[PDB]
Design a protein around this motif. Structure first.
Motif: not given
Lengths: 411, 959, 417
Positions: B398, B400, B426-427, B429, B432-433, C382, C384-386, C401
């Motif tokens: 995965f 990132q 958290l939405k 964040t 990244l990815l 918590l 990074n949201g994965l 996500h």
DNA sequence: GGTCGTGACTGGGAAAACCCTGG
DNA sequence: CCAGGGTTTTCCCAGTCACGACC
């Protein structure tokens, strides 16, 4: 009295209530002797049950579904008042043979009564039999509750019309909640549920002040509260709350008492039983009675309305308008909005008459397609609440509708 | 009386018929030819066997023009093509006005003046035109733009779909959505040449009226195919050589059928443009609105190029096709008409539904095994799987870049707000990815490609892109041939692995192998058999030819007990509709309203007011084949009728409107008869001169001597094998083909003897070759010699009407190559000319007696006419007398002065209301499980023979 | 049997059906006298009913719902074998009164038999009682249909368990469709509805070949069809269709013919009745059987799983917590729980259980419940949201996500159909 | 033998997302 | 501290091979 009769006539004309006028007795409606509800009534009950189920079972982790059969087989404790399930074959055979004396007939009747099945009068009895396994479902953690939307049967003794001892059979659909809670904080849970259900009932009403609550206590000292709605002719029971205690649970499994204990924290105790029970049919009647105001239009809350949007075809070539209407109808159905397919009717009733008819059927919005719609893409939209006509892009109708439904729901 | 016979005791035509149709007298064959022919027939021993005489038939014909058969035909053809050639020469020799300055913007037609003045004329008023049509496929199949050229000036037409922008349009086309290109009732008839005119024809408004207005068409593509065409192999080699065996002059005298290539071949000059933006193929209606000028310029350029090709080409076509019957017939193969009732939409719905449900069944059966294959990745369990080992088993990373208590209402609201805020935190964040999403990592390599990416609009959950043709599907089902696991190599196709290699050959197996080149050590890679010989690799195990292998025990599904046979049964079910669903559902229908229907159809009791009756106009390239055949993408390739093919009733759905019935027939043994008659003309001019000829004509299939049986008797093999061999031989095949097929049909015969058997079999049939070089001593030597004589000539004309072969096939350019193509061209082009003769005769006969008739379709040999109900048998009699006339003319061209009775009339002139092979079959398809009488209520039609026809019609043509 | 025994064991253990193993006999399950269903079973039946109701009523513009009173009050036609409903108050008054006689008791029993109600044995007879009003609803436009889902009571016969002649009363939930059609269109609609029903039952099945249709005629020659499912022990009737003609319709209102005429375009006819009734409970047991694989080909196929169709599985997703700060992770899990609830997705509150079960054990437990996906929130979540997702069919672990879970789940459930 | 579609696969080129270079 | 030179990955489209439809 005229207003009540006018409202009953309206519900009968527009397929909310079913049957003839004489068969539509207010006492029959209240007592469950009604011949049945119209298809619009079926949809209304479905929506009411959906909102009750969503508000009770979905959103709380300690409530799990329970299914109790409509009967209870014999033998049964004497003194039960439920309708006895009787096979006509044995009665006919006993009638044919008159050799048995009066005492022998009495003995046979007593034996059958001790062995006659019964139709359930309240789901409370059935739920308790499910206390063991459903308790095991939460790893013996308390509190946990059971619920079952469904119908029961109750006797009706109409003093007005009984000559040959004729007792009718009434059937009412009720929503039940059996909250197995530890004794320590029982009344706190009672108050929580009470306030929640008052809020829930007032949520969908046009004039929530007509709902009320009242306290009560049984003969054995069990604290209770009861909810009533103010029908025009008076207040009628719409939901009951009782603090049943532990009499029933102890009675049910009289042996290893520890097996029925519940784990409250670090201890094992017998839980207290809370009963929640209300007549969803009578609530449907209550909402219908609330909606009547004198333009006779039924303003059922959008989240409970049976028909959400209606379609019609205006002046112009039939085939093109019909194809467009069918496409829109399919799109709307695909997105979870119940629609009325009025575009098939050819009766050239006036737009005013059609608007009156649809409003009396408690339809939120009215969509009509004409030649100009094929010209530019705007569809005439009528507001039930405002009597104002709005023209909106045919493409954006569904988003506006779903936004209206959600906005009504969150308000 | 009427009975007669030939010098070989064959029942010929009746005295009245022969006198009417053969004048009087003739140079009868001499006794020397009779003696030679008798000696030949005796040598092969097919002499004497009599047959039950066919009943004598009498018929007084309508007046036959001219003073001979050929003269009568030519007079009829001149009458038929008198106006069309006049208009063609008028357009060919005419000044072309300058191109318009700027193309106007007005719905419908617009006339462009010499100086550029634009006037909207209601309808074009010219005897000849060249037409180009433009279709914006995104917004339906309604035509969009038309620019027309004529001797006067250019003409321009634009659809309403470009001028005005409504909200929506009807998905079913109406006649009002077409181009008014017709002459309503100083001249009559009109000709509209064009490139791929069939495409242009379908958008003409009046060509959908069943009344049948007077108009014809000429496809310059058809002319090019007839003049300097190329075969499939020739076309492939032309393209390859242009990109980059001997006698390569043909690369300089031919090209492919695209307009630009034809322009280069004929007039050359500057290469034509292309408009790389391809707005019409892919675009938007607003986009076409904005870019009108350039697109119309390209349309007018197409018109000009087509006109240039037509003008520079028309003289050459007549120079190589000097028989008027050829052109007259080419006119009539391009006026096809098929009527379709309201049952069309229901047909599409049922076909699509059945295909969808079977597809879902197959796909879920595959997906179940697919998902369970993932569980072999953990623990490295893929390695020991005999079938799923060589697939990709690599993952992707995965990327990132205690008590209790209730709650207060305020506390509940606060907790709800707090939880919602914490979730929404958290939405954010996302910073990244990868910005471009990854596509299902973690799943093994084989799994990820099967599933679609979430960006796909039509995504469905699970591995839903599985069909039986995938290279991993068989391993995913784990097929084991004869208890040996399968395996695929691109060097030798599919096959099975037999364990037992110690590093060779098998110890205890035989088959198509082993092939040591493809090495997976420890086993050997044999090869599955195919129906095209061992030189071909087996491409997909789930194929039709493996259906016998499903039940016989040779093939085992492996991971099933009954799914496999069900799998190949579903495969065969939806195979046809899989390919055909695009073009079948892409057809055009113009549902003619009640206003434009004939009065009689409305007056008919079986008329339905609520029903919709419409029609389809097939797009047929009149000469799209090197043998000058027709080419139609769908209908010439439409499955007839089967109870195991979905959508196989397409032809049956073509149904007459109320008040009309279809009348049709089909030629009998046409290729073999033409070969026999050519051989007879070559040997002595007497029917049955060769053994092949007698077997074709008087062969007794029931008991004794017949072409298919007699070859089997000599070889000693099954009758079906002999028939297959004979068809291959007439198509043209060599001894190695015969030995391979013989070894295939029987594994008990060794090649050492199979070669001798094949050479003897061929020697009996075709014969040997002695040098004088030709074919002598063989039962079919004369016909082969005649065919090669026609083929190898400097200017090979068709034996019948003398239409020269395509110049790319002349011996001056190919010499000793492409022999098989030319020799096949002989027979097939004779057949096409025969169809032309049939059509011209039918047209004249229907015009002579005021028969209300129309053309349905010309499926090569088949001919179907649409005639009114009342005179149904009159049309049958017309068809029968047409058959008589055309076969007599065919004999006369070769010179024979007599024709046998046994072929003098059609075997079954079928009368029916829906096109199908036989009037009897109900063709209960898997999409129509009940039947036509139950799904659409059509009756079984009546089939009639010549005696029945003459009895019902009294043998007369008037009312 | 061993596979069937395992399936029954699982359905009892993970609370699909309710009751003891003695009551969980095949005859008990089929006959309508089972002790009841587990909570997951109730959810499964509700989902199946929802799918049926959508596919039958929601996507038909000419079909409307009907409600039949659960009992038919008398007086009834003679010869009916249905049970009689008797109030306990009347029996109490009869037994307590000592002034009654033998003749009085006989007269009372005669009156009770002559004036007693009955439980509904089929939905059809009550359905027709609404024909006039419903016909008025659709402006006398034929065809039109009435639909209803509910429980009907049937008798049960037995020879071994029945000691004292006790006839049991069995309950079954039935979906009934009454389709009134012009006579010209009898077999047309009959075949169309047969095809639609067979497609509907095959649509959600993992192995549709085990579903079948068979034509059969009644004693009166009226056309009908019956659909079956190949249980490990044989076919069981799961749905019937009949062309009732008009005998029942004419008998229901024998008074005047002019009130019951229906319009087919411009013509008024008395319509023929097609009745479609299916067995919901038997179909639920059948889908339970279909979802469980009867492994008897690869020898190495462990992991008992219930491959219910995703639109029918009772609980869509499940949540869990790994190592980390309990309070913050619990807040995250409650937020995700509420978010997934708000979108019509059923979620199993797995983050509340305090048992520290091994991950393989929890995967097995959630698989036996036929849970489509297993969602795990850990410290990285918590960070990074994965979030993690274990697909039931694939058992492969992937990460998405956390804000992308709602759309993926909704798209999955919708497009699965 | 001629003729037409298709689909699955594939190789090579074009479009889009990265590393650390340095003034 | 970011634009790019070169890098890589991914997306797409022409072509190829096997298949199944009428003759």
């Amino acid at each position: 009295g005229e207003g009540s009769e006018a409202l009953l006539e309206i519900c009968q004309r527009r397929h909310f209530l079913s049957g003839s006028k004489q068969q539509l007795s207010r006492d029959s409606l209240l007592s469950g002797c009604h011949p049945g509800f119209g298809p619009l009534g079926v949809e209304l009950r479905k929506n009411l049950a959906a909102e009750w189920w969503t508000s009770v079972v979905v959103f709380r982790e300690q409530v799990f579904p329970v299914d109790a059969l409509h009967h209870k087989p014999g033998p049964l404790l004497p003194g039960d008042s439920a309708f006895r399930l009787v096979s006509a074959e044995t009665l006919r055979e006993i009638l044919q043979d008159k050799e048995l004396s009066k005492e022998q007939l009495v003995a046979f009747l007593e034996n059958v009564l001790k062995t006659s099945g019964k139709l359930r009068e309240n789901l409370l009895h059935g739920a308790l039999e499910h206390y063991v396994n459903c308790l095991d479902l939460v790893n013996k953690r308390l509190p946990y509750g059971l619920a079952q939307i469904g119908v029961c049967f109750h006797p009706v003794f109409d003093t007005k019309q009984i000559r040959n001892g004729v007792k009718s059979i009434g059937e009412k659909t009720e929503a039940s909640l059996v909250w197995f809670t530890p004794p320590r904080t029982s009344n706190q849970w009672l108050d929580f549920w009470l306030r929640h259900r008052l809020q829930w009932w007032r949520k969908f009403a046009m004039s929530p002040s007509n709902f009320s609550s009242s306290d009560c206590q049984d003969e054995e000292g069990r604290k209770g509260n009861k909810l009533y709605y103010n029908f025009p002719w008076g207040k009628e029971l719409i939901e009951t709350l009782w603090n049943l205690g532990d009499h029933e649970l102890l009675h049910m499994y009289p042996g290893n008492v520890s097996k029925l204990h519940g784990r409250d924290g670090r201890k094992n105790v017998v839980p207290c039983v809370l009963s929640v029970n209300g007549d969803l049919d009578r609530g449907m009647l209550a909402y219908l009675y609330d909606s009547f105001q004198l333009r006779k239009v039924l303003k059922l809350h959008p989240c409970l309305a049976p028909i959400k949007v209606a379609l019609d075809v205006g002046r112009g070539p039939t085939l093109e308008l019909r194809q467009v209407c069918q496409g829109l109808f399919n799109e709307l159905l695909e997105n979870g909005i119940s629609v009325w397919p009025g575009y098939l009717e050819t009766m050239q009733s006036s737009l005013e008459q059609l608007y009156s008819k649809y409003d009396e059927m408690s339809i939120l919005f009215t969509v009509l397609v004409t030649e100009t719609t094929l010209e530019n893409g705007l569809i005439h939209l009528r507001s039930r609440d405002t009597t104002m006509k709005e023209m909106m892009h045919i493409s954006k109708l569904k988003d506006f509708l779903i936004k209206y439904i959600s906005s009504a729901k969150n308000v | 009386g009427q009975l007669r016979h030939n010098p070989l005791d064959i029942q010929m035509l009746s005295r009245g018929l022969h006198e009417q149709i053969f004048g009087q007298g003739g140079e009868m064959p001499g006794e020397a030819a009779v003696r030679r022919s008798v000696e030949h027939l005796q040598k092969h021993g097919l002499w004497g066997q009599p047959a039950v005489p066919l009943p004598d038939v009498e018929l007084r014909l309508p007046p036959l023009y001219g003073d001979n058969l050929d003269q009568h035909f030519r007079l009829l053809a001149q009458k038929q093509s008198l106006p069309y050639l006049e208009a063609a020469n008028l357009l060919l020799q005419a000044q072309l006005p300058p191109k318009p300055p700027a193309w106007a913007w007005a719905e419908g037609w617009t006339r462009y003046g010499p100086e550029g003045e634009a006037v909207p004329v209601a309808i074009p008023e010219e005897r000849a035109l060249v037409f180009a049509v433009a279709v914006c496929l995104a917004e339906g199949t309604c035509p969009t733009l038309a620019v027309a050229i004529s001797p006067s000036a250019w003409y321009s037409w634009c659809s309403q779909r470009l001028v005005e922008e409504r909200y929506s349009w009807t998905s079913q086309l109406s006649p009002a959505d077409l181009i008014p290109l017709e002459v309503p009732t100083d001249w009559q008839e009109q000709l509209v040449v064009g490139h791929n005119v069939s495409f242009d024809r379908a958008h003409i408004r009046e060509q959908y009226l069943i009344q049948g207005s007077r108009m014809r068409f000429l496809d310059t593509m058809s002319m090019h195919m007839a003049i300097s065409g190329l075969s499939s192999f020739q076309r492939s080699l032309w393209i390859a050589a242009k990109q980059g065996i001997s006698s390569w002059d043909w690369l300089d005298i031919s090209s492919v059928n695209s307009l630009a290539e034809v322009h280069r071949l004929y007039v050359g000059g500057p290469p034509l443009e292309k408009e790389p933006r391809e707005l019409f193929v892919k675009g938007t209606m607003k986009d076409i609105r904005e870019n009108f000028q350039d697109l119309m310029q390209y349309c007018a350029q197409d018109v000009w190029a087509t006109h240039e090709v037509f003008q520079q080409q028309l003289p050459l076509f007549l120079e190589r096709c000097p028989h008027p019957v050829t052109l007259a017939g080419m006119l009539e193969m391009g006026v096809s008409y098929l009527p379709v009732n309201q049952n069309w939409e229901r047909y599409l719905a049922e076909a699509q539904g059945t295909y969808e449900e079977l597809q879902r069944e197959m796909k879920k059966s595959l997906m179940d095994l697919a998902n369970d294959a993932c569980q072999l990745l953990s623990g490295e369990r893929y390695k020991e799987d005999p079938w799923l080992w060589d697939l990709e088993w690599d993952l992707q990373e995965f990327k990132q870049k205690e008590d209790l208590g209730p709650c207060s209402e305020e506390e509940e609201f606060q907790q709800d707000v707090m939880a919602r805020a914490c979730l929404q935190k958290l939405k954010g964040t996302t910073e990244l990815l990868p910005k471009r999403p990854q596509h299902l990592p973690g799943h093994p390599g084989w799994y990820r490609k099967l599933c679609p990416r979430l960006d796909d609009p039509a995504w469905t959950p699970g591995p839903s892109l599985l069909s039986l043709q995938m290279r991993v599907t068989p391993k995913l089902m784990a097929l084991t041939w004869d208890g040996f696991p399968l395996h695929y190599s691109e060097r030798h196709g599919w096959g099975y692995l037999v364990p037992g290699r110690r590093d060779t050959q098998p110890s205890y197996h035989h088959g198509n192998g082993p092939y040591n080149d493809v090495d997976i050590p420890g086993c050997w890679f044999f090869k599955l058999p195919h129906k095209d010989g061992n030189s071909c690799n087996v491409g997909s195990p789930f194929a039709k030819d493996f259906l016998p292998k499903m039940e016989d025990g040779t093939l085992q599904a492996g991971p099933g007990g009954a799914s496999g046979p069900r799998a190949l049964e579903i495969n065969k079910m939806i195979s046809f509709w899989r390919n055909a669903h695009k073009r079948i559902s892409s057809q055009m229908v113009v549902w003619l309203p009640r206003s434009a229907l004939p009065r009689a159809v409305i007056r008919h009791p079986d008329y339905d007011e609520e029903g919709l009756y419409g029609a389809i106009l097939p797009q047929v390239v009149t000469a799209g084949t090197i043998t000058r055949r027709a080419v139609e993408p769908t209908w010439l390739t439409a499955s007839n009728a089967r109870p195991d093919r979905v959508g196989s009733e397409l032809k049956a759905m073509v149904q007459a409107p109320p008040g009309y019935t279809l009348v049709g027939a089909d030629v009998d043994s046409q290729e073999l008869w033409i070969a026999a008659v050519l051989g007879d003309a070559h040997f002595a001019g007497m029917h049955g001169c060769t053994a092949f000829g007698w077997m074709t004509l008087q062969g007794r299939k029931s008991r004794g001597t017949d072409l298919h049986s007699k070859t089997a008797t000599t070889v000693g093999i099954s009758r079906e094998h002999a028939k297959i061999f004979n068809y291959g031989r007439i198509y043209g095949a060599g001894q190695p083909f015969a030995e391979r097929l013989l070894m295939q049909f029987n594994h008990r015969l060794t090649q050492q003897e199979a070669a001798e058997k094949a050479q003897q079999m061929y020697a009996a049939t075709k014969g040997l070759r002695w040098y004088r070089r030709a074919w002598k001593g063989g039962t079919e030597s004369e016909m082969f010699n005649k065919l090669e004589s026609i083929a190898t000539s400097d200017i090979p004309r068709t034996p019948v009407l003398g239409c020269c072969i395509s110049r790319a096939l002349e011996p001056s350019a190919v010499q000793e190559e492409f022999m098989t193509s030319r020799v096949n061209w002989v027979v097939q082009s004779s057949a096409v000319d025969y169809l032309h003769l049939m059509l011209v005769a039918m047209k004249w006969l229907f015009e002579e007696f005021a028969i209300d008739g129309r053309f349905c379709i010309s499926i090569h040999d088949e001919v179907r006419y649409l005639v009114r109900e009342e005179d149904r048998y009159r049309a049958a009699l017309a068809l029968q007398i047409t058959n008589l006339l055309t076969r007599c003319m065919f004999a006369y061209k070769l010179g024979l002065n007599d024709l046998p009775q046994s072929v003098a009339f059609f075997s079954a002139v079928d009368i029916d209301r829906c096109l199908r092979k036989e009037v009897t079959m109900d063709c209960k398809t898997p999409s129509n499980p009940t039947g036509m009488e139950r799904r659409y209520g059509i009756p079984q039609g009546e089939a009639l023979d010549i005696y029945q026809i003459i009895e019902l019609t009294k043998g007369s043509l008037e009312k």
